[PDB]
């Protein structure tokens, strides 16, 4: 650890059940002063897929979206959301913090089950 | 967002001299920090490295017992202290953070 | 100290040829290697951190491959500004040691 030891985000929560069309949100709360961190968010498959991220990712077309990223007015929590969740949105979510250091180091939250009911 | 170097030029053999490396922009005092230097016309060759806090150091075999690395977390600079030059010395010293953010470099020509 | 020992010694190509450039290792540092650019009169550039993470504001064409002994830097579609030194280096263990350097050179 030449570094130095920067602890890993949370998430919450651990299953969320949301009805289908509906909206599903989870809460990320991460506080570093220091440095330049920005905060991603995942889903898996049989494996990262990332969805969204803050500050919003502009760089990719592809125009409106359903997975989204903000941060709470306390600059601590952070707001997860899939809008107009569909069946087969269900599956192990998480999130993670990264520096933007060029050889930029990446620490994942616990991850979490979303279900879509109806 | 930089890192600026210092102390560097000209010195006869066996006297000293003594670098100084200080990093901007950034967090210095919990990144770790390296120093790497190249011969003129040959490759990089990694010379010392520093843990943050500096618990621990370790350095090149060609350096040792004459090179000394450490830092100020303060006035956030990274020292370098380079005694017993030897003419195989001559280099150009980079400091950078384990994060990989390197410096313009410094030049040291050791000469009679 | 481990030996990387760098292949080939100079690589003669044009602007969107592919390169792969080849470092093999005294020993075993697992994903431990970087791989690094530096043109003339520069500091040496990130591009390639454990043998598959690619360095951030990095361009895509950029990437890696192998493990242990053996590792791969590989620039797919190859541009005028990447015309340059490439060197790798192992953080396995003390102390960290460097290639020799691959030189990118325009093949005419």
């Known amino acids: 650890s030449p570094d130095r030891p920067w602890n890993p985000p949370t998430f919450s929560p651990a299953l969320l059940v949301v009805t289908e069309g509906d909206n599903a949100t989870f809460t990320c709360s991460f506080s570093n002063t220091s440095e330049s961190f920005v905060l991603n968010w995942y889903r898996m498959s049989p494996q990262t897929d990332k969805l969204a991220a803050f500050p919003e990712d502009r760089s990719q077309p592809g125009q409106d979206s359903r997975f989204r990223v903000t941060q709470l007015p306390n600059g601590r929590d952070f707001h997860m959301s899939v809008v107009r969740a569909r069946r087969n949105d269900s599956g192990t979510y998480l999130c993670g913090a990264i520096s933007l250091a060029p050889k930029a180091q990446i620490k994942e939250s616990l991850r979490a089950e979303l279900r879509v009911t109806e | 967002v930089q890192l600026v170097e210092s102390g560097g030029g000209v010195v006869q053999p066996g006297r000293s001299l003594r670098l100084d490396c200080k990093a901007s922009g950034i967090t210095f005092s919990n990144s770790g920090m390296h120093w790497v230097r190249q011969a003129p016309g040959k490759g990089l060759e990694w010379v010392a490295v520093?843990?943050?806090?500096?618990?621990?150091?370790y350095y090149a075999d060609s350096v040792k017992g004459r090179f000394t690395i450490s830092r100020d977390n303060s006035k956030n600079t990274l020292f370098l202290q380079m005694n017993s030059l030897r003419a195989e010395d001559t280099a150009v010293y980079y400091c950078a953070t384990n994060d990989d953010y390197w410096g313009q470099g410094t030049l040291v020509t050791v000469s009679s | 100290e481990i030996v990387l020992t760098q292949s080939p010694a100079t690589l003669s190509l044009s602007p969107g040829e592919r390169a792969t450039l080849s470092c093999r290792a005294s020993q075993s540092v697992s994903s431990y290697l970087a791989w690094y650019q530096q043109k003339p009169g520069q500091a040496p550039r990130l591009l390639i951190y454990?043998?598959?993470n690619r360095a951030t504001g990095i361009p895509a064409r950029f990437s890696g491959s192998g493990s242990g002994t053996d590792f791969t830097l590989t620039i797919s579609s190859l541009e005028p500004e990447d015309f340059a030194v490439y060197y790798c280096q192992q953080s396995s263990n003390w102390p960290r040691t460097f290639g020799q350097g691959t030189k990118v050179e325009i093949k005419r």
């Open positions: 520093i843990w943050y806090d500096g618990s621990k150091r």
């Open positions: 454990d043998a598959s």
